[PDB]
Symmetry: C3
Subunit: 242 residues, 3 copies
């Protein structure tokens, strides 16, 4: 049996109606639903989980305040420990990105300055393939450099000109002959070299008394190697230190 | 006073009975429990926090939609802001780890790639103790190296052989006498050095016209120093660049 | 609105009218109204369920992070980056993460830095590098030179790199460790009498934090010499 609706139960208690035992039985069970709802009838175990019943008789929410839920006058809210990595807005709950962290579709991820030598991929954070240039710039305190497949050169302005530290690549080394190293199309004034047998010499420092190094100036050079007698003639442009 | 149960109370309105005032009081108070539960009786302040009462009289949950909770057809739910760092499954709420982040029992952590020169410890993320090898490999654009306690050497394959860039370690330097530097048991062809006193000379660049560097080849060498006249007799083997 | 309970009782005091019964029926109907059980209603509100015994029960969405148990309504965290205390839900930081006013990268002296724009190498990371390259345990660095010291046998040998356009002289007396002149030295060579020291050794002097390094720095543009006085620092 489902209890009658209100309008129907009422006309059972209309003037000049004979209210039967079963009409009162319907009234009692109707009245009893509020007590069943709060778990108060014989054989019930009290308010369901998540509910309390006050002494005034009010049904009340039981938030586990130790497990991240609070209830107040604005309603049921997630309890975020403030400034501890989490953030809540009308949009929902989210992680708050501090220094070095970025948050986007992939999730919480590492943000790096690429100018500063670091990579981040699927496999984790790491040095990129040009971190070494930044290292070498700091080593010599160079404000400009060139790099290509046969040489790299780190430029230091000083006095009326500049001096550069030189390193070979791919097996190659830098010629030290006059006319083989041009900054801004100017031949060099001085070089210091490492020496090999039979007039082989490899330029390790180069200096221009009156030519300055700046972003965009050209570097022209003759690279040599210890296996063949040929020579690459490079023409590149200076770039500011990273 | 604790209201009678439904069957007991029914019995007081049985056929032929004259219900007393106290039977009706019991009925009224039992009917009243619905109103009490929603804070509707005199002395009460209306629905408890977390609850609302519709114009139809229905009890309803009041999620604070500005603070992380939603209620829909599916139930009471945490509202996660989409793709802002957090995730939710049947297993619970979790952090979504993007590139360079890993999540484990320890918590949210940085993942570093193995061979790219980084470390992560409880003191933070830093460079590991062999990062310099990756750096020197990119500086010279080398695909192979050896490194032990007295030298490291960086190998560049070119033309019919290869040429190597040499750095001393632990106070030591590479001899440049013929027969003192062997790749694959072959003596070197040409070499480039820095000069010391008398016959002191330190190999900086070593060449083999017709021998290629490759993982597993042996590198044998005579390391020397400026304090004692003794030599170290090295025999290591080439590893690929990081 | 409906009579309060004590007003109702007066109407059923020791013959009730139909409007009294009506108020009692309507009063009794409020429990059913609340659980969405009357004609014209669609059952319990969202977030509520009604058990077969007739008890109102919460409906947590067990797949959207809420559980209800004996202890109350709770956030359901997977134990996977998150932690809940009496102060609420927060992020659990592992190795390389710090938590404070959001989630940030922590760096160790180990060459890395973190700023507004991300994690990168700092400005002295190259020192850790040249220390590992040469296996040096002490260095100096100033504007015109840097030097990496390697203790071995009875004394010390160092590798040298010029900075700012400069180079280290190799004249006896121009390079002092603990105020002692060097013994052996190895150079790159230039025109006339220009040479640049790249390895320098003291047979009976050791490197250690504190020891002074004095040197004569030179360059290729001018004839002048910087007169350097610095002190050795431990490798990072």
């Amino acid at each position: 049996r489902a209890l009658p609706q209100a309008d129907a139960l009422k006309e059972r208690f209309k003037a000049g109606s004979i209210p039967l035992q079963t009409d009162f039985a319907d009234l009692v069970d109707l009245a009893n639903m509020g007590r069943q709802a709060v778990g108060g009838t014989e054989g019930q175990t009290g308010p369901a989980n998540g509910f309390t019943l006050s002494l005034e008789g009010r049904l009340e929410l039981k938030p586990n305040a130790a497990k991240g839920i609070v209830v107040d006058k604005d309603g049921i809210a997630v309890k975020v420990e403030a400034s501890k990595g989490l953030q809540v807005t009308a949009s929902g709950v989210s992680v708050q990105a501090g220094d070095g962290i970025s948050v986007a579709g992939t999730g919480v991820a590492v943000k790096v300055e690429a100018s500063k030598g670091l990579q981040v991929t699927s496999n984790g954070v790491g040095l990129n393939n040009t971190a070494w240039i930044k290292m070498m710039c700091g080593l010599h305190n160079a404000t400009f450099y060139v790099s290509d497949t046969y040489v790299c050169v780190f430029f230091c302005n000083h006095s009326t000109g500049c001096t550069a530290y030189v390193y070979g690549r791919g097996g190659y080394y830098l010629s030290m002959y006059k006319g083989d190293v041009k900054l801004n199309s100017v031949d060099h004034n001085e070089i210091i070299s490492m020496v090999g047998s039979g007039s082989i010499a490899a330029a390790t420092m180069v200096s221009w008394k009156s030519t300055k190094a700046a972003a965009g100036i050209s570097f022209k050079y003759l690279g040599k190697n210890l296996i063949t007698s040929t020579s690459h003639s490079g023409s590149v442009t200076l770039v500011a230190a990273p």
